């Protein structure tokens, strides 16, 4: 058991704490310099473990006054070995993050501290920058809206606080470079993650896409918006609520065909009109207005489901965002075009050493074992949990639940106890706020739209009689400090209103009230017609719901409804598990291709003279054309060399260089050798005329432009195949093997096209 | 809007009749035009016989609305203001060392399609020069059309010089003075000086029988 090893390590930490206290200032920075010089002599990271943890403990005492406990040293040494150190919520994990990032950044490689959203990153950045700048290291906060040079200066530091979106987009924009100095990242060394459950389990489903703007079309969107606006709802389109999708009925198809004047909707000529109709219908029905986006300055900003914030850069795909812009008469803008694609699993698997603290990862320990090769070290609490959590109060129809939670927060407001009202969607928080407008209770709503006052709202949410309605921004890492006189009456009565997508998220929301052994109250509230229950509930118990009457003055008391709630939540977790596993084992193939392509692109960026590279590509495409004509299985002396010599004189060589009598039925290897000799002489002429450098820049531009274009076409075709392979699993074969074989064939076609294009662009210019 | 409505591909009918020195010519043709890329792919057929004046002296007479515009010069176009209402253009084309074309064309969306109805009258000619001697190479160069506006006529006056590769090894510098008129009278857009950077390509079809000109052409604008 490694816990005893961590415990005796912590005892050693306390032993060296016993004599490090009497050290004066300015020797701590001298101790950092001493560690830096002693490291490269013969020492490793594990040799300098105890003294570094003791000196950073002493530095924390001298700077911030928060002396780390015994368990935080155990978490730090667990984070050094590369294992997930699951600590319970509110146990002070931030200094536990400061320990091994001070240990591992003495090499000078660079250590990335990753978390979920922006404000949490900035708060941890300023506090641990105040800690680390006393030691003598450089801490650079990475943002979303920085410049290229600001990002370059940030990753040049020792410790880079950043979110996961910015790190992913910086790696992905790090492989669309036309130079080398415009690169922003260092080599990848280390990544201490916070909230590993969310990043590597919850939002590991959605991959990262970068897109540039393509050509713009307009007429189909507004025509489809008018047609969908005249559609009479339930009779003409179905709307399944088990999964968010809509399709036209037969009468809707007849109305669609008689509206646009076409004869058949599902003809192959009218694929664009049908696609626009379907996307406009999905934008008009499935996407509610304030549950999944907002309206800002004529633009549409989508609201992330996982972190709860709004991300100003990321539109939707497949023309869905244009239909949302056409829903409210806004200025429709350009269309997207995929440039690069990476998931979070492969990107964090490139990091070569990583670890991460969390709050609730004990449920997913086998998934952390199978994928990232890590195990979950449970860690004690140093003080017993007094966070009392009552069981759920399941209600009938939703306005009864809102009345009950309004009565609860009213009876708790007149006692001085602060209450954080959790929510999930955005507009329902405003519904609770305007339901609290009557009875006169002051409050600060924390929406996705009111996000700029977040720091003062959060620090003001721990005083006497504070009421805070907050959506998922307050979910993951919001630290609410208990103010004055509040611990007497058991402060921070956290009241949720919706069962979340998984047990970890609402368990974190429950754990928001604990805060180092302080008394808190955690009550939930559910509805029988709630979105989760109506979206994933079992159909057998739906008839039993009407058996309990309808007055909604009291919650239901039954074990059947609790069993149905837990079964529905576990079904949602099972669906997310299946989607995660399927997306990972489908993206493994694209990982294997993408690593090779980025490796060759980075190889041809920093070459002093890549004459041999274009020589090898030209001769490979040349001999492939040589074998494309003149086949082994026909005969000699009927190979039709006129077409081949025309192809050589137009594509590879100049016009007046060759005829049929130059070869006229020779061996193919010697004839491609002769063509290679003439190409070598011509390229020597081009090199001696352009000089050494301008020719190099010219073919570098040619290679990079062609490689980017064909890689974009390949990733688009790969996604188009990825839908069809899930369809293709109908004959009794597993689809993943067929996907791998077809992906390899398309990769070969792409690399043959890349060699042909670079040959015919170098040799004719 | 108007031609912002026609971002997709556009059918192009060209009809030309004309007379030079009492000698008849009649050439027609059909193709496609695109605005978001801004190109013209046109298959043209001489449906009267043989060319009195050759095809390179014809190509500036052969539909200037199919330019490619980047984001900033979207305000500064005239050729999306008179369309779909219709367009009229006449040119004085002075050949140095030879006579003069007066060309007479209306370029308009008839029904849907872009029809260029051209009648060309070429006067002041001596037959023993270069053009009726057919001294032209089968090619056309790259150019810059200078565009300005006049407000007494509220139309567009275009100035440019063009350069024909003569088969003796010389060039015919010939200057176009171009007058550009709306047909409808809606929102007119009269911008400042700018220029169409244009380039062309003349080729043929190996599986076609008669004397036909295949035109492929790129237009871009710049300046404003």
């Amino acid at each position: 058991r490694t816990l005893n090893r961590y415990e005796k390590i912590a005892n050693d930490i306390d032993a060296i704490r016993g004599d490090y206290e009497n050290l004066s200032d300015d020797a701590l920075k001298h101790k950092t310099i001493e560690f830096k010089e002693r490291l490269e002599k013969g020492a490793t990271t594990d040799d300098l473990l105890v003294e570094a943890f003791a000196v950073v403990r002493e530095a924390s005492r001298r700077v911030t006054g928060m002396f780390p406990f015994k368990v935080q040293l155990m978490g730090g040494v667990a984070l050094h070995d590369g294992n997930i150190a699951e600590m319970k919520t509110g146990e002070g994990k931030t200094l536990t993050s400061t320990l091994p990032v001070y240990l591992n950044a003495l090499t000078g490689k660079g250590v990335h501290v990753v978390t979920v959203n922006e404000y949490l990153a900035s708060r941890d950045a300023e506090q641990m920058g105040k800690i680390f700048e006393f030691l003598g290291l450089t801490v650079g906060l990475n943002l979303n809206s920085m410049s290229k040079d600001e990002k370059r200066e940030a990753y040049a530091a020792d410790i880079t606080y950043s979110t996961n979106n910015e790190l992913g987009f910086d790696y992905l924009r790090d492989n669309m470079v036309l130079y080398k100095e415009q690169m922003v990242q260092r080599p990848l060394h280390f990544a201490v993650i916070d909230e590993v459950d969310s990043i590597l389990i919850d939002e590991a489903r959605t991959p990262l896409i970068i897109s540039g703007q393509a050509a713009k079309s307009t007429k189909l969107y507004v025509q489809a918006n008018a047609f969908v606006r005249t559609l009479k709802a339930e009779k003409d389109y179905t709307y399944d609520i088990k999964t968010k999708a809509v399709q036209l009925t037969e009468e809707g198809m007849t109305k669609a065909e008689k509206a646009f004047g076409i004869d058949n909707l599902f003809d192959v000529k009218h694929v664009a009109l049908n696609h626009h109709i379907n996307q406009a219908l999905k934008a008009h029905v499935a996407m509610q207005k304030d549950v999944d986006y907002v309206v800002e300055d004529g633009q549409v900003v989508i609201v992330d489901s996982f972190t709860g914030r709004l991300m100003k850069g990321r539109r939707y795909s497949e023309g869905l965002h244009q239909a949302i812009e056409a829903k409210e008469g806004l200025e429709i803008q350009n269309e997207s075009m995929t440039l690069a694609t990476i998931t979070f699993q492969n990107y964090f698997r490139m990091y070569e050493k990583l670890a991460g603290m969390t709050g609730t990862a004990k449920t997913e320990e086998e998934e952390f074992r199978n994928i990232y090769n890590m195990q979950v070290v449970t860690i004690p609490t140093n003080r017993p949990v007094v966070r009392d959590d009552r069981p759920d109060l399941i209600y009938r129809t939703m306005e009864g639940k809102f009345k009950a939670v309004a009565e609860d927060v009213a009876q708790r407001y007149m006692t001085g106890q602060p209450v954080l009202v959790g929510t999930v969607a955005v507009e329902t928080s405003e519904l609770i706020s305007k339901l609290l407008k009557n009875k006169g209770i002051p409050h600060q709503v924390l929406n996705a739209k009111n996000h700029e006052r977040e720091a003062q709202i959060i620090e003001e949410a721990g005083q006497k009689g504070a009421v805070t309605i907050a959506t998922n921004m307050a979910g993951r890492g919001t630290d609410i400090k208990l103010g004055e006189g509040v611990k007497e009456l058991g402060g921070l009565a956290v009241v949720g209103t919706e069962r979340h997508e998984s047990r970890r998220i609402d368990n974190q929301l429950r754990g928001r009230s604990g805060r180092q052994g302080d008394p808190g109250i955690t009550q939930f509230y559910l509805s029988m017609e709630d979105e989760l229950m109506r979206r994933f509930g079992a159909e057998r118990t739906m008839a039993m719901l009407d058996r309990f009457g309808m007055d909604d003055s009291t919650p239901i008391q039954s074990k059947m409804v609790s069993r149905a709630v837990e079964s529905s939540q576990k079904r949602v977790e099972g669906n997310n598990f299946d989607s995660r596993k399927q997306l990972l084992q489908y993206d493994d193939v694209l990982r294997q291709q993408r690593e090779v392509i980025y490796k060759q692109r980075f190889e041809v960026i920093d070459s002093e003279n890549l004459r041999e590279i274009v020589e090898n590509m030209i001769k490979s495409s040349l001999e492939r054309a040589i074998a494309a004509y003149t086949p082994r299985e026909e005969l000699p002396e009927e190979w039709k060399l006129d077409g081949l010599v025309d192809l050589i004189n137009t594509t590879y060589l100049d016009e007046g260089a060759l005829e049929k009598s130059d070869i006229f039925g020779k061996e193919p290897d010697e004839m491609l050798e002769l063509i290679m000799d003439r190409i070598i002489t011509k390229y020597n002429e081009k090199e001696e005329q352009f000089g050494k450098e301008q020719m190099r820049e010219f073919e570098k531009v040619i290679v990079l432009r062609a490689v980017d274009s064909k890689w974009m076409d390949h990733i688009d075709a790969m996604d188009q195949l990825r839908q069809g392979i899930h369809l293709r699993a109908y004959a009794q074969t597993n689809p993943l093997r067929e996907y791998q074989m077809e992906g390899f064939a398309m990769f070969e076609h792409m690399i043959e096209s890349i060699e042909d294009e670079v040959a015919k662009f170098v040799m004719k210019a | 809007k108007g031609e912002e409505l026609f971002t997709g591909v556009v059918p192009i009918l060209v009809e030309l009749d004309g007379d030079v020195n009492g000698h008849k010519f009649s050439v027609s043709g059909e193709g496609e035009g695109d605005a978001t890329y801004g190109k013209l792919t046109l298959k043209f057929i001489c449906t009267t016989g043989k060319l009195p004046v050759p095809w390179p002296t014809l190509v500036t007479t052969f539909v200037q609305c199919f330019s490619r515009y980047p984001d900033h010069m979207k305000r500064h176009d005239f050729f999306k203001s008179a369309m779909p209402e219709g367009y009229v253009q006449e040119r004085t084309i002075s050949f140095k060392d030879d006579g003069n074309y007066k060309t007479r064309a209306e370029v308009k969306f008839e029904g849907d399609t872009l029809v260029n109805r051209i009648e060309l009258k070429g006067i002041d000619f001596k037959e023993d020069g270069n053009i009726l001697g057919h001294k032209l190479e089968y090619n056309y160069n790259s150019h810059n059309v200078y565009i300005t506006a006049d407000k007494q006529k509220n139309g567009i006056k275009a100035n440019f010089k063009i350069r024909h590769n003569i088969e003796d090894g010389s060039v015919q510098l010939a200057d176009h003075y171009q007058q550009n008129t709306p047909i409808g009278d809606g929102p007119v857009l009269l911008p400042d000086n700018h220029y169409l950077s244009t380039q062309s390509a003349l080729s043929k079809d190996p599986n076609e029988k008669r004397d036909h000109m295949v035109l492929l052409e790129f237009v871009t604008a710049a300046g404003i």
């Epitope: 100049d654 016009e655 040799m763 | 160069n141 790259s142 590769n165 088969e167 003796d168 090894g169 380039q199």
Partner: nanobody
Framework: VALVESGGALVQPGGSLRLSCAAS????????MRWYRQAPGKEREWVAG????????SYEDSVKGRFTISRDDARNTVYLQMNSLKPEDTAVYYC????????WGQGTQVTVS
């Protein structure tokens, strides 16, 4: 199909020097190559050029009987000449061929003083 040119230097009006322009990517043998010049403030004008594989050669009237455009097929380039020049012909000289598109040289500046 990118023209690279050289041979430009500060010259007296009593000396004769050759102006070279290398053709790269296409043969000299079957295309008409022309020489242009453009002074600072002057518009780019045609000076000389020969067609039909160099048996008939035309020149402008300012250097007619003075200049001579020559070429070599093995060297795949052309040669101009600055015989009997004047300070009026101070310009940046260009070579121009038309193979499908029209490609210009980068420009060789010659100044006379």
């Amino acid at each position: 199909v990118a023209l690279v040119e050289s041979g430009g230097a500060l010259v007296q009006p009593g000396g004769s020097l050759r102006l070279s322009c290398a053709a790269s990517g296409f043969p000299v043998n079957r295309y008409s190559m022309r020489w242009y010049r453009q002074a600072p403030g002057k518009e780019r004008e045609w000076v000389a050029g020969m067609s039909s594989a160099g048996d008939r050669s035309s020149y402008e009237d300012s250097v007619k009987g003075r200049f001579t455009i020559s070429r070599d097929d093995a060297r795949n380039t052309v040669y101009l000449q600055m015989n009997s020049l004047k300070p009026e012909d101070t310009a940046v000289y260009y070579c121009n061929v038309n193979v499908g598109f029209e490609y210009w040289g980068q420009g060789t500046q010659v100044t006379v003083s």
